[PDB]
Structure 1
Amino acid sequence: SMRKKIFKPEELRQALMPTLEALYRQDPESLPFRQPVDPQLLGIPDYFDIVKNPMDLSTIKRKLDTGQYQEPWQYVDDVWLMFNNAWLYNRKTSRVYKFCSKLAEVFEQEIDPVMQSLG
């Protein structure tokens, strides 16, 4: 009975893109997240056993760019999935885990006022 899909996908693309862009701008911290994790290249054959739903910046970019997000929270859910996969798979002491945490912090700071602009 509630209202759904009040925003056009293209309005969400415009509103949210800056938050994606801020993650891309993080150097070196975005580098492990730019492309899908390739278990064969990284020599981690258990990756897809542990991470059942992979997500990365390129995939999010392409969904946002092509209007695949129909609700703002669907984009946020994908960013969080990317982070949560990285924190699940990687050791807490690891370079990639620390980089995840830095991206997560940048994202939090970026997304809160944007989601208020959608209020």
Structure 2
Amino acid sequence: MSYDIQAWKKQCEELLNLIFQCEDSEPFRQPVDLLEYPDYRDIIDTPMDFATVRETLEAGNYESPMELCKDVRLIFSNSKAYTPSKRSRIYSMSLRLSAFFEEHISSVLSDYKSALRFHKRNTI
């Protein structure tokens, strides 16, 4: 529906489903095992993963698609900080998946911003 302030929830749910199904998301689906990779938190202040993003959305714990988008960009910025090289196949996966995410999130955010203006301003 046009001007739907709720539309982003289904749009983001769908986008996360497509990400989970993509081979490029394998390294990012689940929290890094901090007992297995004991220097991860020495480098990364704020871990993030797609399972936490999906669970947060399903819980209603995101206020806006902008909040969800910040957590997804954190997955990718964490990967760029923790991988040691552009030679890393994990880094390459993160760049492909990030480009895909940025392609689809832009219209979610612009459709939400328009809906929110309507929500606040309409007299119908």
TM range (shorter): 0.7 to 0.9
Report the structure number with the largest CA radius of gyration.
2
Whether 1:65 and 2:65 are equivalent positions in the alignment is no
Whether 1:82 and 2:78 are equivalent positions in the alignment is no
**Which one of 71, 88, 94 corresponds to residue 94 of structure 1?**
88
Structure 1 gaps, min length 5: 1-6
Counterpart AA for 2:35 = Q
Q: CA deviation at 1:82?
A: 0.7
Counterpart AA for 2:54 = K
Aligned to 1:19: 15
Counterpart AA for 1:25 = Q
User: What is the total number of aligned residue pairs between the two structures?
Assistant: 108
2:9–2:65 contact (8 Å) kept in structure 1 = no
Q: CA deviation at 1:25?
A: 2.1
Q: CA deviation at 1:47?
A: 0.8
Query: Secondary structure, in 3 states, of the residue corresponding to 1:67?
Result: coil
**Which one of 31, 35, 58 corresponds to residue 40 of structure 1?**
35
Let me know the Cα RMSD of the aligned residues: 1.6
Q: CA deviation at 1:68?
A: 0.4
User: TM (normalized to structure 1)?
Assistant: 0.82
Q: CA deviation at 1:24?
A: 1.2
Query: Secondary structure, in 3 states, of the residue corresponding to 1:30?
Result: helix
Q: Where in structure 1 do 4 or more consecutive aligned residues deviate above 6 Å?
A: none
User: TM (normalized to structure 2)?
Assistant: 0.79
1:13-55 C-alpha deviation (Å, 9 max, x unpaired): 223212212211211x1111111011433xx321101101000
